Amino acid sequence: LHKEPATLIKAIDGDTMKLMYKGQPMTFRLLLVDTPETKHPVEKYGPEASAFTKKMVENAKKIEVEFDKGQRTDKYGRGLAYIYADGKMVNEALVRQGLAKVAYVYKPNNTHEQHLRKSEAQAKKEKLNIWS
């Protein structure tokens, strides 16, 4: 796996954002996590998660995307990646805060599954947000 540059266009919610990738606007969805819903007819913590992600990506010097080993886009045409803001994985950051659950683990896009799972466990142990 390798990290590639991208440019933030717009934060959408906790786990979705619009990025400029290779000179094309693309919706990206975070691999291996689910932040709570705020669009589809609002879950508890859905708003917080969004704010968190929005802040984390807006404030970054650099945004990078890292595809996994399998599919790079979902059925909705969303890029599927691990996305890093100045080197800190957004996917992990959310989970570590109890603002996301590890979810949608579709092989073979599961390289960071164990890392994320352990962040989840700590968050759960610390009774943070979703786990509170």
Ligand X SMILES: Cc1cn([C@H]2C[C@H](OP(=O)(O)O)[C@@H](COP(=O)(O)O)O2)c(=O)[nH]c1=O
126 binds, among its own copies, Ca ion, ligand X, none (CB under 5 to 8 A by kind): its own copies
Residue 14: Cβ within 10 Å count: 27
131 lines the binding site for ligand X (CB under 6 A) = no
**Which H or E element spans position 17?**
strand 16-21
Tell me if 80 sits within 8 A of 29, measured CB to CB: yes
Contact code string over 25-64 relative to Ca ion, x by CB under 5 A: ---------xx-----------------------------
Distance (Å, whole) CA 47 – CA 81: 22
In the stretch 13-52, what mask flags binding to its own copies with x, by CB under 8 A? ----------------------------------------
Spatial separation of the C-alpha atoms in residues 76 and 95, rounded to whole Å: 23
Residues that bind its own copies (CB under 8 A): 70-73, 96-97, 108, 122, 126, 128
